């Protein structure tokens, strides 16, 4: 029995589907804060804070776009991570941030502040380019451009999942419970126990699919995460100390970050917001097919415009609420499709469940206190799924010798751009300092980003290549 | 004017298209000897030898599968009777990485714990012995199983495996582009990185070289004439190598020091010698069988022929039979397993000619190129960076092609899930160095432990893992 958008359902059902959505998107909302924090800072205080903050903010802005007028689940984007890797690396290299003992980086919140200032800046850049360009964008970024970019995003990100899976990127410290690899500067090291953990998560997800009932759908990642986490607690991999030490409350601004602060990663941020625009379009349309609605009507394109507008608006809002850019989650469309319900009430239930979970900031702490390995397996599955979906996007464009060539050059040159650390030999080979050099550093940022390069090559070839 | 299989075409035309084919498959034939050799030994004698030897033997066994006049007497025949270009497979590299790694680790081969690995020809002899052994494992399983194999290795299983083969192999391409996997030595011309044990290090110049090769390929397509097709790779390689010579990246000393002759057994390798990588070899030949099937069918559609006829499947049977037969033949000739080259189907389609005379001219051109063993050395004398850009393009194309294979199956949540797990776990299996914690955690030595090492070999292999996960999931997962 398929449920339309606007109809009251048994409120128990609405709550339950709200829960399934909440759990489904949980991994996707939770993981990027963990990734950004670990790659910049240590304090568990701030991690618990940003997980709970994320939960609350995401609940709120999902509520904002659920009223688009169809189940429009919103959550933190994964593109901003791939940008921030290169960003932070340069901030620690030629930037202002500081280093210790050859490897260990000092937490540098001014970087995050720059990130939020810049992203808040360029969210506007996107909302103002959100107005009336629907099919045009579809033409400018076809699946032959779209697919490779996304594939390489998931690929370049999968490394961190595998690293945590290993037990990294920084192996456990002194006096901390259950060290099985203790060392400064081992990014991909870890003992067999860690492998077994992440693998048990992965296998847990797989079995979760094999014996998967309509509720367990899209929770398989989160359920696997949970299973591996329970086994983890059974073995003794936990820090109940920091769990106890965490506060059981969270307001949106318990902790705050620098303002009037921006970086030179402005353009990559703009690129991220474009990505989020295209993604929003695809995700919303998909929902419309899932929700048995119009797919080309004027009302449809109105839904898309509202979706993208609310997208960038909530990017600004989240930035003010100390959150990085966020976009449309695509897990839900599965849930809806298999549960036959696209009611706004499931989404709102979800939203409230999230905000509430964020308030009880012990859940956040329990999340931060999940071993790097369980997180590792779960995330590796996650990014793997991203790669696979980018590929599914690829296959929408006819595989001719032309498209195969364009994909080849874009993939290879993009990932090739990922491999290289940095460039210098031109304006900066002698370590020079001109007005350009500071934005030579910005060019370094774009160049270092893999998917940016991929997208540039794809668009360039599709432009200059002859029609087969 | 579309030219059929059997029609005399201007022998100038047949020769020229023979040349285009020769150049087309040149890179794909030449590269695996370079990769296996560099990853085992140093002597330029053996590299030049195996390059020219590869040219010769592939020409000969291409001649073996282009015709059916060799075996057909009464029953089903060998090999194919339409353009069936043959050349050394890339699966054997992906296997030989882990294989050789285990041979230098727990095997007999030696190292001196200071700089590069000692050359170990007995490893190659084991490789060849084992592969020659299992080519027979594939030919006798080459008899009458056509659509069956298609069902056992559908696109959902087929595609990921190929992708990961391409992925885990591409690393050597990038490494060479950088200037590796061992940066240039002392007194050797144009060292820009000299060091023991830097596998992916290298200066800007190396980047510039390989990148000029790659850019040369792209520009070769951009201004590409029908002859330059599938030569774009070899043309880019050539361009970047010319530029390389211009900068001064050349070793005319070893080029001069090379012999201008090459017979099939100028140099030889151990016999009665096998490793424990037998099963990985069987996997290689399964790969090559399916590969033959798909490549041939592609050719039949290119050459305007039957696609479901009995004659068609007869052609396939012959293709796989000649595949494994030429695998044994090549192995006796000190060559690794070889299978059907798929570049050609483009050329034909773009040249409207599937004449066996293009193929035979090609073959002769290759064998002749192999005899003149100064070309072989000229190939060996290409900087690792030029080689790098070119090979990188090659493997990237392998991955993408595996993906095109993938897309043949309806992208459902089921198929997406299976792809996800298969890719992730295969590549993860690639990441880990080795396992021990069970039968060998205490460094034990029982009768099993030696083939515990074989399980270690398959386990280390990325695509084998990928495929096992893929098939197991596709089996036990319910139909969506
Ligand atoms: C850049 C934008 C990336 C594109 C979005 O790509 C999206 O990745 C998500 C990751 O949550 C995949 O989602 C996958 O992981 C989630 C994790 O909760 C599972 O619940 C879900 O069953 C699985 O499909 C989607 O299949 C894909 O649509
Ligand atoms: C230096 C230059 C920088 C230039 C930067 C510009 C980058 C532009 C890249 C485009 C981004 C790709 O945007 C992509 O859009 C498609 C639809 O088109 C979304 O949608 C795709 O995947 C989702 C799964 O989650 C499906 O629901 C959908 O049917 C499919 O098309 C992708 O999830 C998103 O990743
Ligand atoms: C398992 C075996 C791997 C599958 C074979 O994969 C095959 O690889 C070759 C590389 O030679 C790709 O071919 C590619 O590189 C060759 C280089 O010789 C170019 O001439 C050609 O234009 C290009 O398509 C094919 O498109 C792909 O189908
Ligand atoms: C531990 C377990 C070990 C068991 C290992 C088993 C591995 C077997 C993997 C199957 C190998 C993949 O085999 C694959 O077959 C397809 C057809 O399906 C071939 O063909 C595919 O690509 C070629 C391009 O080159 C196209 O011409 C063709 O149309 C396409 O189908 C591929 O070139 C080959 O790579
Ligand atoms: O789980 C997720 N689903 C998504 O759609 C998405 N987009 C960015 N980041 C995301 N994470
Ligand atoms: O150039 C190549 N093309 C191929 O299809 C192939 N298969 C194995 N080895 C190969 N080399």
Residue numbers in the entry:
A (entry chain B): 66 to 132, 145 to 545
B (entry chain A): 66 to 545
How is this structure described in the published paper?
UapA from Aspergillus nidulans is specific for the purines xanthine and uric acid but does not transport hypoxanthine or adenine. The overall structure of UapA contains 14 transmembrane domains (TMs) organized into a 7+7 TM fold divided into a core (TMs 1–4 and 8–11) and a gate (TMs 5–7 and 12–14) domain, similar to UraA10. UapA forms a dimer with an extensive interface and a buried surface area of 6,000 Å2, involving TMs 12, 13 and 14 of the gate domain.
A thermostabilized construct of UapA with a single-residue substitution, G411V, and lacking the N-terminal 11 residues (UapA-G411VΔ1–11)17 was expressed in Saccharomyces cerevisiae as a green fluorescent protein (GFP) fusion protein. UapA-G411VΔ1–11 binds xanthine but is transport inactive. The structure in complex with xanthine was solved by single isomorphous replacement with anomalous scattering and refined at a resolution of 3.7 Å to an R-factor of 29.6% and Rfree of 32.7%. Density consistent with xanthine is visible in a clearly defined binding site approximately halfway across the membrane in a cleft formed by the half helices of TMs 3 and 10, similar to the uracil-binding site in UraA. The current structure confirms many of these earlier predictions, revealing xanthine is within hydrogen-bonding distance of the side chains of Gln408 (TM 10) and Glu356 (TM 8), the main chain nitrogen of Ala407 at the N terminus of TM 10 and the carbonyl oxygen of Val153 preceding TM 3, as well as the main chain nitrogen of Phe155 of TM 3. The phenyl rings of both Phe155 and Phe406 pack onto the xanthine. The residues directly interacting with the xanthine are all from the core domain and in the structure a detergent molecule packs over the xanthine separating it from TM 12 of the gate domain. The xanthine is fully accessible to the inward-facing side of the protein through this detergent-filled cavity.
